[PDB]
Design a protein around this ligand. Structure first.
Ligand SMILES: *Cc1ccc2oc(=O)c(C(=O)O)cc2c1
Length: 224
């Protein structure tokens, strides 16, 4: 997260991290006791999921292996359209005040809405600074018309853009697959943006969760 600050402790119980070799790979969100929602770009054969602490490296956190995952079949590594994946935990997440399911959206929040994006991704770019504590930043939803001025026909209608005018506030490498929450619901998953990160007036691009409700529920049901 670029130009953010540490999240208030205990305010992101639905936030998870996907680890590989005890290093941060991606962010993610807890959907229910058995499932984690993340970006399809985060695909791996095996995952170690960190849950229940704002601090990566915290002995208090749960560490659950996940051997199965399912990318949306429409996912393209070329254009990043349909960038979402469900990760099946090997054992159930043990719920508490620090581990809770996210609230999935019923509706799509409009342009101009204030949201919060969170993650353990680098706080600097191109030079990397990976934090221990979970970082937060507030951004506003940007209309597809305004976002098209930057990214042209690379943008699809199931992608959601967010940022702050003339501001570096944004997500970066390591935050991928993590949550963008607006008015109490999960509206986006961190997907892509410009590189170096935090470039003013280059919006962050997210998978628009409200467009994928059916697939998310059907996939969990089928692979239960
Ligand atoms: C989209 C995506 C896939 C895998 C990634 O692995 C990583 O380790 C990072 C990072 O900067 O921690 C980002 C990734 C993004």
């Amino acid at each position: 997260i670029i130009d953010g600050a540490p999240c208030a402790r205990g305010s992101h119980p639905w936030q998870v991290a996907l680890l590989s070799g005890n290093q941060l790979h991606c962010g993610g969100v807890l959907v229910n006791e058995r499932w984690v929602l993340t970006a399809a770009h985060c695909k791996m054969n095996e995952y170690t999921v960190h849950l229940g602490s704002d601090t990566l490296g915290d002995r208090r956190a749960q560490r659950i292996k996940a051997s199965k995952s399912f990318r949306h079949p429409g996912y393209s590594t070329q254009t990043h359209v349909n960038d979402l994946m469900l990760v099946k935990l090997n054992s159930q997440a043990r719920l508490s005040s620090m581990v809770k399911k996210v609230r999935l959206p019923s509706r799509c929040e409009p342009p101009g809405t204030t949201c919060t994006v969170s993650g353990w991704g680098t706080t600097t770019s191109p030079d990397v600074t990976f934090p221990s504590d979970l970082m937060c930043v507030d951004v506003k939803l940007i209309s597809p018309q305004d976002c098209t001025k930057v990214y042209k026909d690379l943008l699809e209608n199931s992608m959601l853009c967010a940022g702050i005018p003339d501001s570096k506030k944004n997500a970066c490498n390591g935050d991928s697959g993590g949550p963008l929450v607006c008015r109490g619901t999960l509206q986006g998953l961190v997907s892509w943006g410009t590189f170096p990160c935090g470039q003013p007036n280059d919006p962050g691009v997210y998978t628009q969760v409200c467009k994928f409700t059916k697939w998310i529920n059907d996939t969990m049901k089928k692979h239960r």
